[model samples]
Target chain A: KVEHRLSEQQMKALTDLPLVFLITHDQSKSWPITHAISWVYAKDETTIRFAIEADSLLVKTLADHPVFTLIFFADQSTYSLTCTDVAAWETTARLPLKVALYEGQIKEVRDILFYGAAVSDRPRVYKTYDEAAAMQLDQQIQDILKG
Target chain B: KVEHRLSEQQMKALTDLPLVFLITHDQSKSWPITHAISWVYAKDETTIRFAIEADSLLVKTLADHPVFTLIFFADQSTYSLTCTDVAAWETTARLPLKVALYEGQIKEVRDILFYGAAVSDRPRVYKTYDEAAAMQLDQQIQDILKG
Candidate 1:
C-alpha cells in the first residue's frame, strides 16, 4: 500500500530478476499477445533487451506493431513498464541476450525497447514482513491526509 | 521444447500458482497495459476469475476492450491464455481476490474470462535440467522433420 520512488538498491535488485511477461498486440488480432522472455536490464535501469531468435513469430508480428508492455515481478513487487518506439537489430557481440538465444540462426540479435518507472496502480514490493507492515501504515497515513 | 498437451497433474498444479500477468490494451493509446493479478481457476481450468477493485482503471479499460491475454508461470512452464468476452459480477464469495480488496464496498466481485489451451508461440517452461536437455533434443528432431 505504501508508495515511494524506487531506491537505488531496488533498481539494482531488479536486474537480477530475468523473467518478464511481455504484452504485445497486433491491429489484426482481437486479443493481445503475452510472451515470457528472459530479459536483460540496462545498468541504468531505464532500458531492457531480449533475444528474439531469428524469424520468430514474435519478431514478425512486432515488426508491424512495435509498442508493448513489460511486467517484472520480484519477491512481491511488480514492475509494470510501458514501452513505445520499439526496434530490433542483429548483432554478434556478447551482450545481454547471449544466454537466452536458442539455436540455428544467421546472427540472432536482440529487440531493444525504452521503458520508464513502473506504472502499475498497485505494484507489490517484497521486503521483510515487518517492512511490509510499515509500508501499509505509511500508506494509511497518506490516505488519511488525502481524505 | 517438448510439445504435449497439459497433463491432469499440470492443470491441477496451475491452481496453486496464484500470480498471473494480465495484458489489456486501450485502443486510443499506443502501448498495451500489464497488470499482476492473483487469479482463481475454475474447476475445469477453462475459465478464471480475477478480483478487480471497482472503478479501477483496469476494469474501466477492460469494459471497453473485452479481449485480452493472461499469462501464468509455474516452475519453468509459462501458460498464455487468450481471453475474449469478459464479464464481471459482484459477490461476497470466498475467492482468490478477497485478499486483495481494499476497503468499503457493498460487494467486491470478480471478473471472469474464458481461455483454453496454450496458444502462445513462445511459452517458456522451467523443468529439471535433464528434462530441459531432453526437450531441446526432441525439438531438434521436430525441426529436422519440419525441414
Candidate 2:
C-alpha cells in the first residue's frame, strides 16, 4: 500500500506536536542518525518543514543522502514519515542563533505501534537551560521554519 | 570521555517513559532501521530491558549485529543510549501474546539536543486503539521487561 498523504490523526498530531525524530542516513556509518528533535511543522498533507542547528553533523550527513525518516507520536500510535526531495529552505540571521531551516516531501506515513498494542502516555519533554530564553528561541525557530 | 552510565535524569525517563526510537542495523542496506517503540525499561545505570514483538524485521536484524542505539526525550533534552552485548532476556508464556524480551548494556549516554538550545516540551505519546486494553497490556509488557 502506497499511502503518502498524512491522515487526519497524523496531520493534527504533526501540526500540533512539538517533537519528532529525524532518522537521516550516513552511508559511511553502520547506523542511521536517530535524532530526537523539535521545531518541525506539517505544512500540509504532503509537506513538512523543520529547523535544526547549522553545525550538527546530522545536517551535514542529510546533504550526502538527501533522504530521511521522521517519527512522531500521534493519536493512538506513532507515525513514521518517509521523506525524500529534501531542500534547505532558509537560513536564519542568527535569528535566535545559527539555525538551518529545511523542507521535505512526504513519501509514506505509517502507524508503527505494532503488536496489537496501544500506548497510554507520551513522555513529556522540556528545555532545561532557562524558561524565558528557551521559549523565545523556540518561537524564533518556529517562525523561520514556517516562513 | 567514554561515559556509559545513565544519568539520574536519563534513568528515570527511560524507566518511566512510554516511547523510544530503536535504531537497528542491516549490513546490506544503506540506511538503518528506525522503529518508534514502547515497552522499554531501564534496569539500572548500565543496563536496560525492552519488549518487542517476536517477529518484527527489526528483531531479526538484532540477532545479526546485536548492537543498537535508543533515543528518548528526557528532562530538558533528548538522550541516546548506545548498547552492545544484547541478549534475549525472556520468552513470554503467550504472556499477553507472542513477545520477545531483551536486555542490553549501555555504552554511552549522550545529550544530543546540542548547539546551546533547549526544547520547550517533549511530545506526549498515547495509544489510540483502546485505553483499558492498552494499559493492561502495557503493564504486562513492563512487568516482563523488568523481570
Candidate 3:
C-alpha cells in the first residue's frame, strides 16, 4: 500500500500538538537550518503540513530540495517524521485548513504557503526517555574504540 | 584576533542554561540530526561541551565530520553557535564539571565521552520573534518568485 498510518496514540498526539522542528540543509553552504514551526499532521499520519510566509527561506530552501525531517517533542517524548513529497500553495483558499487548525495564530497571515511531505520512512517514535537512551548507537561506538 | 567571543548577555545565558539542541549531519545520508543535550558553555562562550556515549551515532557522525551547530532556546528567544574544533575526551576525571553542573542528573552515568567544540563564529543572537522572522532569506525568495 502507498499509504502510511500512525498508531492511535501517535495520531492523537500529533494532531493535538502544536509545534515541531523543521530541519533542512543548505546544500551549498553545508549547514543545517532548524526552525520551530507550528504544524498539522494529516489524518492518516502518513503526511504532515505547515505554513509559512510564501517568501520565507524555508519555502525557498524546499524549492531547491524537498527532503527534510520534522521533529515533534512533548513531555520528554519524541517523534520524527521524515518528509519528501513537498509542495506549497500561495492561495488564501488553500489556507482554510491551517487557519481552521491554528485559528488565532493564522488570522493575520495573508500570503500563507503550505508545504506537505509524505513520510519517507517509518516514523521514529520514542515514548520514553529510557527507550531513547537504550536506542543509542553504543555498540557501534564500542567497535570503533576496539579498533 | 581570530578568537570568537560571545557578548556579555549571551555568555550569561550560555553558562546559566543547561540544555541545547546539538545539530549534526550525516554527510553520506545528507540528513540532519538534532538532539537535545545537557551542555556546559565555557566561561568565555567561545567553547561548548556536551557528553554522549562514545558509541552513539552522534559521535560517529562527528568522527567523520566535526562541524556542527548548537542551538539554544528559552522563553521564545534563541541563539545559534556554529561550532568546529571538536574533540572528545574519555575520562571520568574530566567529568567533575558535568557532575557539578547537572547535579542529580549525572549520578547514575559512569561512562560519558565528553565532546568539546570551539565556536567558529560570533553566535547569531536574536531576542525577539519578529527579528527571527525578518532574518529569513526574503531577498532570495523574492528573486525566485520574480523569475
Candidate 4:
C-alpha cells in the first residue's frame, strides 16, 4: 500500500516550526547540505510549502535536479519525506530577506528511525538577530503560506 | 577560518553517543540520505573513525567520489565535518550484522548553526530490536575503534 500523502498528525506538526530539515539533493556539491528551514507549511494533504533564500546554494542545486529528501527529527521519530514534482516561485510578500517559495509533492514518507526507539527530541531553532524583526518575519511567512 | 582538525572538545564529545549524523553525498541518487549511525569515533584531531553496513548505498557512492560530509548536532551547535582522503576496510570484530570501518580525514569544519540561537538538543536513539544486543554491539564497535 502506497499512500503518498501527509498524515493528519504530520500536517498538524508542521506549522511554522524550527525543525531544521537536513535536506539532501542528488545534484549538490557536498554529500548532503543542511538547510535549517522553519517556514514550512502543509498547504494540503499532498502539497508542502516552504521558503528559502532566493539565491541560496540549495536553490541553485534544485534547478537541475528538482528532487529532494527533507529529513526532520520530530514526534520522537525521524521522518524522511522524499519529495518530487517540485515547483518554486518568487514571493512579493516582503520579509526580512529576499526569499522564494517551494511547493513540493510528498512522493514518499518513510520513518527511518533506525532499528531502535526513543524518537529524537523536537529540535528548537531561534534567531540570534533582532528578536522583534525575526518574530515578525516568521509571522509574515506563516500568514502568507497559510494563504 | 578553515581549520580541518577536530577540537579537543569535539573529540571528547564523540564517544559512542547516539548523535545522528545526517550525511549528504553528491553522487547519491536521493537528494540526501539519512544515516543515523552512532558507531563514529574520533580517532584523533584529524582522523575520524566510523562503521556502516558493507553494502550500504553510502559505501557505493563513496567508492567513486571518496568524499563525505558528516553532520551532527551537539554542544548547542551544528557541526558539518567535511571529509576527504577516506580509507575503509573490512573489520574482523564480531558483532551485529556485517559492517566495515571507515577512516576519514577531516578536511573542513564549519559550525553552520544557522543565523539563529539555542542549538539543537543532542538526539537520543534506542534500539527497538534487543537492548542487550544493541548495547553490546555499541560497546564492541566503540572498543574496536578505540583500538
In model 2, the runs with Cα more than 4 Å from the true position are A91-96, A114-136, B27-31, B89-96, B114-143
Tens-digit lDDT track of model 2 for A1-147: 336888777777776535677788677754566676778888889998887778878677878878778877766666677878888876534477777778889888776655445555554555556868877777777666666
lDDT of 2 by residue, B75-120 (tens): 7777777888888766534588677777889878777655345555
> What local lDDT score does residue B138 receive in model 1, on the 0 to 100 scale?
36
- TM-score (all chains, Cα) for each model: 0.55, 0.78, 0.55, 0.85
- For residue B14, model 4's alpha carbon misses the true position, in angstroms, by 2.4
| C-alpha lDDT values of all predictions | 0.45, 0.73, 0.44, 0.70
Measured by C-alpha RMSD in angstroms, how accurate is candidate 1? 18.7
| Best of the two (2, 3) by lDDT | 2
Which regions of candidate 1 deviate over 4 angstroms? A1-17, A90-147, B1-7, B10-17, B90-147
- Indicate the residue-level lDDT of A115 in model 1: 16
Give the per-residue lDDT of model 3 (tens digit) for B1-147: 122445566556556423455668887664576665434453343555555534467667777776776555432244456666566644333332222111111101011111111122221222233544433432222222222
True contacts kept of each: 0.22, 0.46, 0.14, 0.57
DockQ of each: 0.10, 0.37, 0.07, 0.51
**Per lDDT, what order, best first?**
2, 4, 1, 3
